[PDB]
Design a protein around this ligand. Structure first.
Ligand SMILES: CC(C)=CCC/C(C)=C/CC/C(C)=C/CC/C(C)=C/COP(=O)(O)OP(=O)(O)O
Ligand SMILES: [Zn+2]
Lengths: 401, 315
């Protein structure tokens, strides 16, 4: 275990004897993490990195049907709860009974707006985030019943209603603009085969303007580079085949600098704290950059590993991000939630599975039962589901209007 | 008459006389509900009534007061926020009182997207940015890294052209926490949109300012990322004195950032036909190994790539 090695203590923060809110908060985190790493030594047991599959599964299978009023704050994010859960069960290799699947399909139909796109719940106005979640959820289910839920002609219209002259997209009508909208749109339009010639005109250029002096990408031009936005920006560009519009090298340097030398997990932005969900947003960028640089015929790229420490990340996730009761989380001391369960698991899978053409190289830390089903780095749903959904929708022609 | 949702004497809408005419519309979750939330009595009550007024598009003062309760129960419900802006215009509400409202909710939920977008829409409507920089500064006084607060600040400054005092504000916050990356970002935003970094005096002022910071807190990555960021433009090799000046902190202020910066300068010298190419290459390859093997192992795969890539190029 990398994290448990003795020389690893050398990775602790060096505040140069100048304390600020930043160094103080990081230190608190490192101290908490260190206690977790050393728990084994202090209890004289052999470290046993085990993914609590059954704990995680009861939590999920249950949340998929009903939730306490503690989830009232997600009343406008229901298609998200479906995606997060169905995707977590998918990584965990747990099946969806044809009865549950049909129920999820029927619910998402209620969330679908008559004007295209999906709302965060039955009767809510359509928004791009739940539209992305709804389509992803339906593709995880992958039945003809699921595919047929999506009204493709209205969806295209919807995307056009948000398209802006500068290339960006609004998240919803009368709403805000940021890099997320470009990705939600490129993700749902590509999976459903509704991309018209001018739909993403200028979008690649707009996303490129979000890349800043740091190498990463901000929500809108001028903003601080962030992991969630950077994933959305790069993944959207990969979908549009315009990754080259970014300075891939400065981006590669920014994302790899986000892995915490001590904790092993990723931070969202420079000088902030590590967080489990970034196991996917940040680490998920490496497979994307791999594919892109390799598309440029990069000869120096590894043939077995991603350009981040797969071992340290898997260790942070397994030792620090699991809730004994089931479910995953931000960091020790934080509460579990379905968002973190989806992304900690998603980041673990990215961390375990490597691939580059003919090359395939896994790295499963702890017990081999830890290995999860693979996830597609662009869509974050099983690779099979992507191939399956795109092939299906390719039977359909692009709505002409 | 705003009966607070938190008021000890708050009564359910279904128990309210002034609402007795309208029939609450419950949520259609389907016969076989999934990810179904077991709402509390209050939540369920306010939303069933919200659904009723929205469904009949009732643009009343009572509906307007109700959206406030529905927003407080779930500030992320963007459908409610939308209907609220519909009512703000129909009822011709005092938008200044609404600014006071949004000022309060943002203080309570400074990380909510809807609350900030609403404030933006209000500032656009009133074409009045007079309270903005001060309000935002109060949010940043509580969380100096609030992404939404910084985004809003950037939107106000660019939109209404309020650039004059931002570099000073930036200097203020950098003193408080020189490791606040949001502030280093704001510094670059202000400079690039005012003087630009081509002005040699500015560039010089910025590079020297940054170097003094690196001297005081050598392991602060922000200052290093900013130094690389503003010079990276023209190419690090374009600045001959810099390599020497960093090689000098090699024993004193020597973090793995200095090492990594040196490999960066080297990478650019090689690409720009530098003298002593074989020599320079080995140094850069030496540093890549020290980093991969010893100084920055978490990034071993990255530094190895840099190693390979560098050979593949200037072999
Ligand atoms: C919707 C889709 C498809 C993806 C979303 C992907 C993500 C996580 C985007 C991030 C959104 C973002 C950066 C919003 C800005 C406001 C905000 C709350 C940023 C995070 O602030 P902190 O909670 O302090 O977290 P960090 O310190 O880790 O940045
Ligand atoms: Zn998180």
């Amino acid at each position: 275990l990398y994290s448990l090695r003795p020389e690893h203590a050398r990775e602790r923060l060096q505040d140069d004897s100048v304390e600020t809110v930043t160094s103080i908060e990081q230190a608190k985190v490192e101290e908490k993490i260190q206690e977790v790493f050393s728990s084994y030594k202090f209890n004289h047991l052999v470290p046993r990195l085990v993914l609590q599959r059954e704990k995680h599964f009861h939590y999920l299978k249950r949340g998929l049907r009903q939730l306490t009023d503690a989830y009232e704050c997600l009343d406008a994010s229901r298609p998200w709860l479906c995606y997060w859960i169905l995707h977590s069960l998918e990584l965990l290799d747990e099946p969806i009974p044809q009865i549950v699947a049909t129920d999820v399909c029927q619910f998402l139909e209620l969330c679908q707006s008559p004007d295209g796109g999906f709302g965060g719940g039955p009767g809510q106005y359509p928004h791009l985030a739940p539209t992305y979640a709804a389509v992803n959820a339906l593709c995880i289910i992958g039945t003809e019943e699921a595919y047929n839920v999506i009204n493709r002609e209205k969806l295209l219209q919807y995307l056009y209603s948000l398209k802006q002259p500068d290339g960006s997209f609004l998240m919803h009508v009368g709403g805000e603009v940021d890099v997320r909208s470009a990705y939600c749109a490129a993700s749902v339009a590509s999976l459903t085969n509704i991309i018209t010639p001018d739909l993403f005109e200028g979008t690649a250029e707009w996303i490129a303007r979000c890349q800043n002096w740091e190498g990463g990408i901000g929500g809108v031009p001028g903003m601080e580079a962030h992991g969630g936005y950077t994933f959305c920006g790069l993944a959207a560009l990969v979908i549009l085949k315009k990754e080259r519009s970014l300075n891939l090298k400065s981006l590669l340097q920014w994302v790899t600098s986000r892995q915490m030398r001590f904790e092993g997990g990723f931070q969202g932005r420079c000088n902030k704290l590590v967080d489990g969900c970034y196991s996917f947003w940040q680490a998920g960028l490496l497979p994307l950059l791999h594919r892109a640089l390799h598309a440029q015929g990069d000869p120096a790229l590894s043939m077995s590993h991603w350009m981040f420490h797969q071992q340290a990340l898997q260790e942070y996730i397994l030792m620090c991000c699991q809730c004994p009761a089931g479910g995953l989380l931000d960091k020790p001391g934080k509460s579990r939630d379905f968002y973190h369960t989806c992304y900690c698991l998603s980041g673990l899978s990215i961390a375990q599975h490597f691939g580059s053409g003919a090359m395939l190289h896994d790295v499963v830390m702890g017990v081999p039962e830890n290995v999860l089903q693979p996830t597609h780095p662009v869509y974050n749903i099983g690779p099979d589901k992507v191939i399956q959904a795109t092939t299906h929708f390719l039977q359909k022609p692009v709505p002409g209007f | 008459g705003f009966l607070s949702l938190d008021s000890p004497t708050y009564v359910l809408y279904r128990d309210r006389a002034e609402w007795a005419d309208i029939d609450p519309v419950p949520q259609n979750d389907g016969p076989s509900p999934v990810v179904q939330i077991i709402y509390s009595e209050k939540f369920r009550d306010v939303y069933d009534y919200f659904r009723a007024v929205l469904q009949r598009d009732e643009r009343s003062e009572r509906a307007f007061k109700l959206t406030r309760d529905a927003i407080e129960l779930n500030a992320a419900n963007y459908t409610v926020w939308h209907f609220r802006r519909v009512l703000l215009r129909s009822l011709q509400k005092d938008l200044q009182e609404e600014m006071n409202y949004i000022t309060a909710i943002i203080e309570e939920q400074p990380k909510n997207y809807q609350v900030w977008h609403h404030r933006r829409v209000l500032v656009e409507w009133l074409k009045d940015p007079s309270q903005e920089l001060e309000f935002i500064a109060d949010i940043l006084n509580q969380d100096a890294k609030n992404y939404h607060a910084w985004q809003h600040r950037q939107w106000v400054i660019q939109e209404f052209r309020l650039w004059d005092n931002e570099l000073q504000y930036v200097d203020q916050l950098l003193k408080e926490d020189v490791r606040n990356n949001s502030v280093w970002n704001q510094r670059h935003f202000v400079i690039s949109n005012t003087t630009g970094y081509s002005d040699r005096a500015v560039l010089e002022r910025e590079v020297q300012y940054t170097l003094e910071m690196i001297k005081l807190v050598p392991h602060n990555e922000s200052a290093w990322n900013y130094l690389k960021g503003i010079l990276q433009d023209r190419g690090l090799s374009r600045y001959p004195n810099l390599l020497n000046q960093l090689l000098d902190l090699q024993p004193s202020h020597s973090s793995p950032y200095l090492i990594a910066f040196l490999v960066d300068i080297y990478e650019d010298m090689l690409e720009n036909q530098c003298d002593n190419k074989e020599d320079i290459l080995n140094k850069a390859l030496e540093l890549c190994e020290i980093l991969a093997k010893e100084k920055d192992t978490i990034r071993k795969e990255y530094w190895r790539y840099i190693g390979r890539s560098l050979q593949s190029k200037h072999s």
